[PDB]
C-alpha cells in the first residue's frame, strides 16, 4: 500500500542536481516501503537514463522508463501518473529537492482531511517571500476561500491520484503551452477538489538554476489562450472574477508600468496593441472597478490607447520604494528585539509625496495627464488606511521565508511642507529563532531580516538595513546568536556559528583570564554578550608555543558555558605537559576567535 | 627682454606622456615665450628622460636642461634650478602636472601690480570636491595680514619672487629623510616677511593624481612641530600652525584611523602621539578645538586608547547627503532646492540627546564618566552649522563654491529627548561664473553640497532618486541637468555627454517640410529657451527599407528664439523621394528619436 508516488520527468539532467534530488528523497522520514519513485526519461540525449537505472539498482521502489523526446515535461508526467499506484502524487522536477519531513506531514494532513490537493509551502531560491498570502496558516478546508487557495499554481503539490484519473486531469502534451500548471490546478478546482493548505513546514524547494514565449506574438497567443480557458471553463462567478482580475493585473496591466522603461519601442507597440485588444475583447469593465487606483489608471489609459501617457507615468513612478532602517536592536530574555522605521521614497532618497487639494489626497501628476483621467482614479483619499508594514526572515541555507509574527506597526500620512504629505511607518518586533527551526540543519544557519511594506498599490519587500556599526552577541539556551550589519549593510543573524565567531564578536576580558594549573583549567570570560538561561556548548582549543613558528597545534578540550547571565570559555589542559608562553585559540562550533590570547604555563 | 617667469621642473624617470602634456600646457601659455624660461634639472634618470628633454631643448631657445647625480627627491634639483634661474618669479612645476593657459599672465600681472613675494594661485587636484575651500575663496593682494594661514594649502606650486628666496636663503631640505619640505619652504617664506597674495578667481595649477614606517613618521612630526615652536615668532601664527597640525596629524589618527590599522601600528603611533602632545602641545591649544577633538585630546593625554577605539566605532558612518527637492531652469540660470540631514551612511538619523538644558553627544555611560561634562555638551555649538553648494568641472577638475545660496539648519526634536539635524538650501547656477578657458564651454559639471557641524564635515555629490532630465537652450549654451548613471546630479553643457534633441524630444506632428527651400524644420518638445541661439550641425539620411543605406550627409542647424527651439535641416541639392531616415548630429551628439520623413 503506497501512500505517495513521486513523478519526475527528466531530460539531460545535471547529475549533481539529480544526486541532490535522490538524496532528498532518501532522507524522507516516511518509510521507503510506503512510497515509490516513478521516473520517466524524456529521450535524454545525454547519459541521464543510464544514471537513472543506476540509481534504481539499490532502490526497489524506483521505476525508470524511456520515452521519445516529448519536448516538455507534460507527456512524461502523464505517463508516470498512469503507471503510478500511490494514493497521492507529487510532481517533482529533476532539479529540485524535497524537505525531509514532507512526505509524512503532507500525507498525514491529506489523509486526516480527505484532501484531493495538498498545497504545501513551497520555497524558492530568490526573493523574500513566496505565496506570502496563501502560506500564512494551515487551512484543511482551503477550497471554501475559492480558487485562490491553490495559488501559487505550481505543479509542486500533492494530488490525490484517484481524483486526477476520475476527472481526467492531465498535462497538455502534444500542445506546447505556457502556464500549463495554471491549467492543471484550475481544472482540479473546477472539478470540486477538496484543497488543504499546509503552511507550517516547507515542503518543496523550487531551485533557480540558470525559450518558448520570449517572442511577443507567441506570448500573447498563450495569454489569449489562458483567458479564454478561464472564461470558458470556470463556472463559479467568484472564482472566474478572481482569476480574471489576478491575471489581468499581473500579466496585462503588468507591462504598462516599469516594463515600458526596459524594452525597445518595437516590442512595446506590439505588446501594447495585444493588451489593448485583449482588454476590450475579454476583460469586462467591472473587473477594473475593484482594482487599486494606479491599476485603474493603467486600465483606463490602455483602453484609450494612450501609450504615451502610460510611458510618462512610468517615468514618474520609477523608483518608488520603502526601505527600513534599524532604529534599535537588542537582545532581551530569550528573544532579539527590533525597532525599525521606513518612509516612501524614490530610491531611498527624497521623500515620496501625495498632495492635498481641498478635501482629496491626490497622486502628484502633471496637468497634461490629470486632464485625461477620471477624477477618482488619482484620489487616494479612501486608501490611506490600507497600509501594511511587517517583518520577515529568510534562512540563507534553506532559502525558506517566514513572516515574523507578533509585530506592532503603524503608518501615518504626515504633512511635511505646504500641502505635501509623506508616508511614514514605524515597527517593533522580536525574533524567537525556535519558531523557524524545523529541521536539524536549521539550527546552524545565517538568517537575513527583511520588511514588507504595502500601500497605495505599491509593494516593497526589502532587506532591513542600518548605517551605524552593529554587532551584538547572545548565548540563549545553548544557542549562539549574533545580530550584525553584514558587508552589504543589511541585517543578518548568525545562529550556531555558521559564519561568525561569538567569542571574537563578544571580546575577551584578557586581564580576567584565570589559570588553575593544579586543576588544569583556563577560564576565559566573555566581555560583551547577552546571556539568558543555562548553556553548555562543547568545543576545543589549540595551544601553540610562542616563537616556534611551525609547531604542531596542541589540541585540547574546551566548552562555552552560559550561567547566571555571564558567559565564559573553559579550556581543559588535560594530560599535556606545558611550560612557557602559548597562543590559545578557541574553536567553538567550528569558528576560531582572533583575540590573540596568550597564557603562561 | 626681462624673464618674467622661470619654470623649475625636476625630472626623474618621467612618464613620457605626462612630460608631453606638461610641455604642451606651457606652450599653450598666453604669455609671449620670450618672457619666460624653462629650467629643467634631471635627477639622474635611468630612463632616457634626459634624452627627451634635450630633444625639447633643441626647438626651444628659452629651455635649459641639466642632469645632476640622483639626489633621491625633487628638493636638490629644485634648489639648483633656482640658483641658475633668471626670471622675476619662480614656479615649481612637477614633472607630471600641467599649468592652465592664462596662468603665467594672470599670476605675473597680479604679483607685479601688488609687489608680491609669493603668489598663491588656486590649485586644482584630480580628486575631491574642494581644494583650499577656505583660502581660495576670494582674491586678496594683502593676504599676509591674515597670518601664516594665507599660504595654505602649503604645496610648493606657487609663484615665488626669485630675489626674495635668494636674499633669505630659502631652500628645500634635501636630507636623507625629507617630509613636508613644502611646509617648511612656505613657512620660511612667511617668517621672513613675504608679501603674499591669493589669486582665487582663476585655476592656476593642476596637481595630477597618477598611478609608512611609524617610527620615521613620528620622527618627522616631532621635527615639524619643533620647527614651528623654534622659528615662528608671531603668537597668532604659531597658535594656528600648532592647532592645524595637531588637529590633522596627531588627533587625526584618533578617529576612523583606529578602524583601518592593526593593533601593533596603533600602539606605536598612539604612544608617539601621547608623548608629542605632552612634550610639545600646550594645554590652551585644545581649548581652541571643537568638542569632539577636545574629547580626543583629553583621552590621548589620559592614555585611554580603549575609549578612543570605542568612540571611533560610534562615530563611523556619520554623514550628510543632500537630496534634490526641486530643480528647474529660470531665465538664464538653473535653480535647485535641496535638503539634508545628519545620518549614518544616509540611513537612520544621527541623534543628539537633551538632558536638563544640555544637548549631549549620545555616549555609553562608561565613557561619559571618564570625560569632563563640557566636552560632550553641544549646547554652545548648535548654531555653528554650514550648508552650501559647490560645482566641479569634470574635465578641468576645478571646483568652486556656488555663491548666493540661502540655507538653514535646524535642531529638531524627533521623539523623546532625541534631536536630529536637518538642513534646507536654495541656490542657482550661473554657468558663466565658471567658464574661464575655451575648453570650459563643452564640459560635464558635477554638483555637490558641503555640510559642516558638531565637528563633522560632509562634502558629497548632490543626489536624487526620481528620474531627472531637463534641457535648456540659453544664449548659445545647450544645458542638460540630469541624474547620471551613478544617481548623482550632473550638468552637461555643450553636448559633451548627452544630445539635447534626444532629451528634449521632438513634436513629430509639427514637422514642417518645405520643398521650395528644401528646409525640414523639426521643433523641440520640452526645453527651456531663453535668449537667442544658433548652433551649426549636420544630419544623416537613409532610405527606410534599404539594408546598407549608404547615408546622405546634409547640413543641419539648432536654433532658439521666442522661447522656442527647433532644428532646421537643409537637403540642398535634393535627390530623394519616399520615406527617409533622419537623425540629427548637433555638437557631435546624435538623437535616437527614430525620425522618419517621406519626401
Ligand atoms: C525541456 C524538457 C524538460 N523536461 C522536464 C525537466 C523538468 O523536470 C521539467 C521542468 O523543467 P525545469 O527546467 O525543471 O523547469 P523550471 O525549473 O524552470 O521549473 C518550472 O518551469 C516552468 C516553465 C513550468 O511551468 C513549471 O511547472 C516548472 O517546472 O520538465 C522534460 O521532461 N523534457 C524536456 O524536453
Ligand atoms: C623620486 C624623485 C622625484 N623627483 C621629482 C619628480 C617630480 O618633479 C617631483 C615630485 O614628485 P612627484 O612624483 O610629482 O610626486 P607627487 O605627484 O606625489 O607630488 C607631491 O609629492 C609630495 C611628496 C610633495 O610634498 C608635494 O609637494 C608634491 O610634489 O620630484 C626628483 O627630482 N627625484 C627623485 O628621485
Ligand atoms: Cl554623466
Ligand atoms: Mg526545475
Ligand atoms: Mg606629481
Ligand atoms: Mg536615505
From TrEMBL, chain A:
GO molecular function per UniProt: hexosyltransferase activity; metal ion binding
Residues holding UDP-alpha-D-glucose: 9, 11, 42, 69, 77, 93-94, 156, 180, 206
TarS/TarP linker domain segment(s): 216-314
EC number: 2.4.-.-
Residues binding Mg(2+) 1: 95-96
Positions bound to Mg(2+) 2: 325, 348
Nucleus listed as a keyword: no
Entry keyword Disulfide bond: no
Pfam family, one: Glycos_transf_2
Domain Glycosyltransferase 2-like stretches: 5-138
Family under the similarity heading: Belongs to the glycosyltransferase 2 family.
Record's protein name: Glycosyltransferase
Organism: Listeria monocytogenes
UniProtKB/TrEMBL annotation, chain B:
Superkingdom of origin: Bacteria
Pfam family, one: Glycos_transf_2
Main EC class the enzyme belongs to: transferase
Binding site for Mg(2+) 2: 323, 346
Statement: the UniProt record of this protein carries the keyword Coiled coil: no
Assigned EC number: 2.4.-.-
Gene Ontology MF term list: hexosyltransferase activity; metal ion binding
Domain Glycosyltransferase 2-like residue range list: 6-139
Binding, Mg(2+) 1: 96-97
CDD domains assigned to the protein according to its UniProt record, in alphabetical order: Glyco_tranf_GTA_type (cd00761)
Boundaries of every TarS/TarP linker domain copy: 214-312
Positions of UDP-alpha-D-glucose binding: 10, 12, 43, 70, 78, 94-95, 157, 181, 207
Alphabetical keyword list: Glycosyltransferase, Metal-binding, Transferase
Family that this chain belongs to: Belongs to the glycosyltransferase 2 family.
Name of the protein: Glycosyltransferase
Protein's organism: Listeria monocytogenes
Amino acid at each position: 500500500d503506497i501512500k505517495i508516488s513521486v513523478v519526475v520527468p527528466t531530460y539531460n539532467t545535471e547529475l549533481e542536481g539529480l544526486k541532490n534530488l535522490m538524496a532528498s528523497i532518501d532522507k524522507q522520514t516516511m518509510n521507503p516501503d510506503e512510497y515509490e519513485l516513478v521516473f520517466v526519461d524524456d529521450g535524454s540525449t545525454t547519459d541521464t537514463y543510464e544514471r537513472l537505472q543506476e540509481f534504481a539498482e539499490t532502490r526497489p521502489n524506483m521505476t525508470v522508463k524511456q520515452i521519445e523526446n516529448s519536448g516538455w515535461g507534460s507527456r512524461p508526467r502523464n505517463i508516470a501518473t498512469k503507471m503510478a499506484k500511490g494514493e497521492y502524487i507529487l510532481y517533482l522536477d529533476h532539479d529540485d529537492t524535497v524537505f525531509p519531513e514532507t512526505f509524512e506531514r503532507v500525507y498525514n494532513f491529506g489523509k486526516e482531511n480527505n484532501l484531493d490537493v495538498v498545497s504545501g509551502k513551497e520555497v524558492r531560491t530568490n526573493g523574500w517571500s513566496w505565496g506570502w498570502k496563501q502560506f500564512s496558516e494551515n487551512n484543511p478546508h482551503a477550497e471554501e476561500m475559492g480558487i485562490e487557495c491553490l495559488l501559487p499554481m505550481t505543479p509542486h503539490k500533492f494530488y490525490k491520484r484517484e481524483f486526477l484519473l476520475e476527472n481526467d486531469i492531465t498535462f497538455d502534451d502534444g500542445a506546447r503551452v505556457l502556464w500549463e500548471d495554471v491549467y492543471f490546478n484550475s481544472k482540479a478546482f473546477i472539478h470540486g477538489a477538496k484543497v488543504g493548505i499546509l503552511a507550517d513546514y516547507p515542503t518543496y524547494y523550487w531551485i533557480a538554476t540558470g525559450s518558448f514565449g520570449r517572442d511577443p506574438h507567441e506570448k500573447w497567443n498563450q495569454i489569449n489562450k489562458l483567458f479564454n480557458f478561464f472564461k470558458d471553463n470556470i463556472k463559479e462567478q467568484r472564482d472566474l472574477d478572481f482569476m480574471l482580475t489576478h491575471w489581468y493585473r499581473s500579466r496585462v496591466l503588468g507591462i504598462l508600468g516599469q516594463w515600458l522603461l526596459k524594452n525597445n519601442n518595437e516590442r512595446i507597440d506590439i505588446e501594447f496593441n495585444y493588451a489593448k485588444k485583449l482588454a476590450e475583447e475579454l476583460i469586462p469593465a467591472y473587473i477594473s472597478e475593484n482594482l487599486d487606483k494606479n491599476n485603474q489608471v493603467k486600465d483606463y489609459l490602455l483602453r484609450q490607447g494612450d501609450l504615451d501617457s502610460l510611458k510618462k507615468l512610468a517615468q514618474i513612478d520609477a523608483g518608488i520604494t520603502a526601505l527600513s532602517y534599524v532604529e534599535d536592536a537588542y537582545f532581551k530574555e530569550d528573544k532579539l528585539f527590533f525597532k525599525t522605521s521606513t518612509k516612501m521614497t524614490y530610491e531611498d532618497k527624497e521623500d515620496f509625496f501625495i498632495e492635498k487639494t481641498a478635501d482629496r489626497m491626490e497622486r502628484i501628476l502633471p496637468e497634461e495627464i490629470k486632464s485625461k483621467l477620471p477624477k477618482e482614479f488619482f484620489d487616494y483619499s479612501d486608501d490611506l488606511a490600507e497600509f501594511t508594514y511587517e517583518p520577515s526572515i529568510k534562512g540563507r541555507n534553506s532559502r525558506a521565508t517566514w513572516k515574523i509574527d507578533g509585530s506592532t506597526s503603524n503608518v501615518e500620512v504626515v504633512n511635511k511642507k505646504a500641502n505635501l504629505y509623506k508616508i511614514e511607518g514605524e515597527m517593533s518586533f522580536s525574533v524567537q529563532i525556535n519558531d523557524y527551526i524545523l529541521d536539524a540543519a536549521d539550527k546552524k544557519q545565517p538568517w537575513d531580516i527583511a520588511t514588507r511594506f504595502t500601500g497605495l498599490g505599491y509593494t516593497s519587500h526589502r532587506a532591513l538595513t542600518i548605517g551605524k556599526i552593529l554587532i551584538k552577541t547572545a548565548l540563549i539556551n545553548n544557542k549562539t546568536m549574533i545580530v550584525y550589519k553584514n558587508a552589504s549593510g543589511l541585517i543578518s543573524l548568525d545562529v550556531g556559528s555558521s559564519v561568525r565567531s561569538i567569542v571574537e564578536d563578544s571580546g575577551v576580558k584578557r586581564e580576567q583570564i584565570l589559570i588553575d594549573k593544579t586543576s588544569g583549567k583556563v577560564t576565559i570570560p566573555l566581555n560583551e554578550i547577552h546571556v539568558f538561561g543555562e548553556s553548555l556548548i562543547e568545543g576545543n582549543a589549540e595551544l601553540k608555543p610562542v616563537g616556534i613558528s611551525d609547531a604542531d597545534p596542541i589540541n585540547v578540550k574546551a566548552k562555552l558555558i552560559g550561567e547566571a547571565n555571564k558567559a565564559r570559555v573553559e579550556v581543559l589542559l588535560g594530560d599535556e605537559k606545558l611550560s612557557g608562553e602559548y597562543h590559545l585559540v578557541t574553536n567553538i562550533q567550528g569558528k576560531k576567535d582572533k583575540q590573540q590570547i596568550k597564557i603562561t604555563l
